[PDB]
Amino acid sequence: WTATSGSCKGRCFELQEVGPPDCRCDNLCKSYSSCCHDFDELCLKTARGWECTKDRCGEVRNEENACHCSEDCLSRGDCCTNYQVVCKGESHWVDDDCEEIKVPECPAGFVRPPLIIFSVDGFRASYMKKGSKVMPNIEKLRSCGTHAPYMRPVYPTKTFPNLYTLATGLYPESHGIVGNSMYDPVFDASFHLRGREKFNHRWWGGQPLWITATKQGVRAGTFFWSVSIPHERRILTILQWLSLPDNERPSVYAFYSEQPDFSGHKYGPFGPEMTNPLREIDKTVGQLMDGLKQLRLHRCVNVIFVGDHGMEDVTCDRTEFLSNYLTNVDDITLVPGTLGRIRAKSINNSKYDPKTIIAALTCKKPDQHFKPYMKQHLPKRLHYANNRRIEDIHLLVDRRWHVARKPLDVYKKCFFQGDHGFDNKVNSMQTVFVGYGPTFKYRTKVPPFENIELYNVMCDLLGLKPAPNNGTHGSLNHLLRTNTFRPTMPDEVSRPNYPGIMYLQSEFDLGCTCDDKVENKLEELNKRLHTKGSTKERHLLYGRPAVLYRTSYDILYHTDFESGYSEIFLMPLWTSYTISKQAEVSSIPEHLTNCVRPDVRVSPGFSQNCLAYKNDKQMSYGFLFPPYLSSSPEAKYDAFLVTNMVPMYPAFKRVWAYFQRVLVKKYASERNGVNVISGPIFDYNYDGLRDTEDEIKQYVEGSSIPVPTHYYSIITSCLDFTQPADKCDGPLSVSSFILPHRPDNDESCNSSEDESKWVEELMKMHTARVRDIEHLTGLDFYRKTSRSYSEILTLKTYLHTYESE
Ligand SMILES: *[C@@H]1O[C@H](CO)[C@@H](O[C@@H]2O[C@H](CO)[C@@H](O[C@@H]3O[C@H](CO[C@H]4O[C@H](CO)[C@@H](O)[C@H](O[C@H]5O[C@H](CO)[C@@H](O)[C@H](O)[C@@H]5O[C@H]5O[C@H](CO)[C@@H](O)[C@H](O)[C@@H]5O)[C@@H]4O)[C@@H](O)[C@H](O[C@H]4O[C@H](CO)[C@@H](O)[C@H](O)[C@@H]4O[C@H]4O[C@H](CO)[C@@H](O)[C@H](O)[C@@H]4O)[C@@H]3O)[C@H](O)[C@H]2NC(C)=O)[C@H](O)[C@H]1NC(C)=O
Ligand SMILES: N#Cc1cc(-c2cc(OC3CC3)ccc2F)c(OCc2n[nH]c3cnccc23)cc1Cl
Ligand SMILES: [Ca+2]
Ligand SMILES: [Ca+2]
Ligand code: NA
Ligand code: NA
Ligand SMILES: [Zn+2]
């Protein structure tokens, strides 16, 4: 209940929220149906519009007007944004030449440059170039400030997940806003765009910027604007707040535009009807900048122009229906559209089986436009699993398509021509970033980066300590003139052992065999030196990775590769090797096909054994350093060491063998050598973080050999590919993957064909950042390069996407 007969007199857009049943004049009052009786009259004035005209110049103040053209308006902070242009012969901000802002030029009493976040819903990245002729204000921001060619949103590429990611630096799985619609089974409650339940604070995890600010003594303007408040009024409210006295004035502000998303849904991303919404957004930017200029803040405020996601062409006719696949279609609930999420209609139905639903949705039609996944099998780059609000069954929908339960759901709801929500690496979902101000760089282009990184930077811009988040603080230092955060490398927690030869052959009883009994002082000293690390500079180019948790491991040196061998997991945590452009691929000789060799540096008790694999009818093995890339017949024996073996399902060995036999050499040819680091990952609870021993759910039968959930590789070369990988003087280039270790290739519908038609496609889908691997392994890479640490942090957040331009 609201006693709406209090008044908003002198309280319009009050920052502090007053408590029911006392009536509200703050922004959200509309959304709670709680504004005071006179809120529209006092706070939403529209009289005479939003622009001064010559005849109004120096008028007598009339408090009914939406904005003012009277001599006292500047000191009141409530002039129309074009007041100085119309009435004082000033230029619009957009018509002024741009001039470097070397230092903040702020009015007295400003403690720090304010930050304004100008967020635009549905603003696809390519609009910056394709719409540049109709967006002069935005184009000046872009060209004069710091910009990326695009910014990667998070998955799903929907509004609230992305704007709340911007606010918190967290993946949706951690912040809790995992789509625009959700069911939380602990709460037994549903979150929707419509209605009121979405304002309940239990939906919203982490700590958004406005709370981070407030807790640290920095005042914040509103981040949420009610849909009925027009854009001109949002801008005027921000400008008025900026005119407050020093002790009352916020330091961080947000503007939000529902456009171009609103029109994009109706008309498609490049519909002719899209030109107007872009013109209008640009006009709004013009109003803000003119307003800032009038208040002498245009060379003081840092402005971020940022989108939440892009927009793709999507129509009703490109809809797949689950009713064409499942018989039981009324036993399920689908969250539909540009992604699919499936759960049981009733928890009382114990005849509901996820395995049979997945199988009925897998590779059933030749051009099928969605792919089902148990959430733990989604590409790890999506970070979309560790939340009870994300249903176990997920459908990744192809760009340009929808999924629905039944046809009736589409015509009892063609209207729309645009949508978004798809995989966050899809080009059409990419959105925009521009930063303009004293703290940003001048006329600077930066590479594309992920929106999870911005929270840290916004905290840096405001002198705030960020709450714990998924950004990598320092990775965006290259955007900034000053206020950089100077991170240090994490300390190594576990130092390795360096074992020598400590065991005789006959101490091992592993059930392994190798045809290797084949016998020189020239080559005897030479092989001793390889085992003490004489080739390690060739194979370990960026130093050894640091182990950031407590464990027991050994460094093992060899002619062609170096490894960090875990005594706890009985396999390497990592294996490092360099393949030059010139290297030759060879086969596994006939006599070595089943060869596994005890490693006399490592006890039997901390070794794998061949008998376990013999007895485990589902599990085979592979090697981390590939025998195919041995430098010589003699060196090839090292590749068959039991310490280089890892457990692999035969179906996965098809993938791994093609990667090692064909792809590594291809990449060395294309990139002028590559350094490769490969290893296992264990993420049985799908939290994106390294498992401890006691979290492992599967072992090679009858043994303590833990089975990885995934295998990674990090492939590094010289960005200047005219230099070979192993003699690179400058910046590096990386691509990585985290392949799911699956007992079938059901994910790849064309897997009956030759690996050349499907393996690389799988690997592209599971592309990853080095940082993703770091989380999953507790390893810290690139510890010894000639590069700055901030540059290395940037490299570690790079994602190789495999989209064209
Ligand atoms: C991305 O960045 C984020 C942020 O840094 C990373 O997330 C952190 O990961 C940590 C490890 O997974 C995690 O630490 C745990 O926190 C527990 C306390 O948590 C509460 O308080 C914090 C701080 O204010 C708060 O942020 C949390 O908020 C979560 O939950 C509410 C809903 O209840 C949501 O509003 C919110 O969205 C958020 O949900 C997300 O996180 C939780 C896990 O915390 C998930 O379950 C959800 O799915 C969702 O993703 C909390 O309200 C603390 O109690 C834990 O301690 C246990 O583990 C330690 C290990 O040191 C052990 O020693 C203890 O014994 C203890 O175990 C006991 O409880 C067990 C479980 O009940 C039980 O089995 C044992 O037997 C014991 O009794 C732990 O320290 C941290 O909370 C989150 N933070 C956030 C914001 O998510 C994330 O990892 C990064 N991602 C990547 C890929 O790097
Ligand atoms: N950084 C950031 C940032 C966060 C938000 C946001 C606000 C929120 O407010 C609580 C009361 C729900 C919650 C989550 C958010 F992510 C945001 O919201 C703009 C918005 N105003 N009006 C809309 C209508 N629909 C969708 C979004 C908005 C804009 C930005 Cl720049
Ligand atoms: Ca949106
Ligand atoms: Ca884990
Ligand atoms: Na086997
Ligand atoms: Na298949
Ligand atoms: Zn939309």
Short mmCIF file of C-alpha atoms and ligand atoms in Angstrom, two decimals, residues 363 745-752, ligand 6:
data_model
loop_
_atom_site.label_atom_id
_atom_site.label_comp_id
_atom_site.label_asym_id
_atom_site.label_seq_id
_atom_site.Cartn_x
_atom_site.Cartn_y
_atom_site.Cartn_z
CA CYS A 363 21.51 -35.08 -35.12
CA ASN A 745 31.36 -37.88 -30.74
CA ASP A 746 27.61 -37.21 -30.64
CA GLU A 747 28.34 -33.48 -30.59
CA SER A 748 29.78 -33.73 -34.09
CA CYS A 749 26.97 -34.86 -36.47
CA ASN A 750 29.49 -35.53 -39.27
CA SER A 751 31.86 -37.67 -37.13
CA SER A 752 31.42 -40.86 -39.23
NA NA B 6 28.54 -38.02 -34.24
#
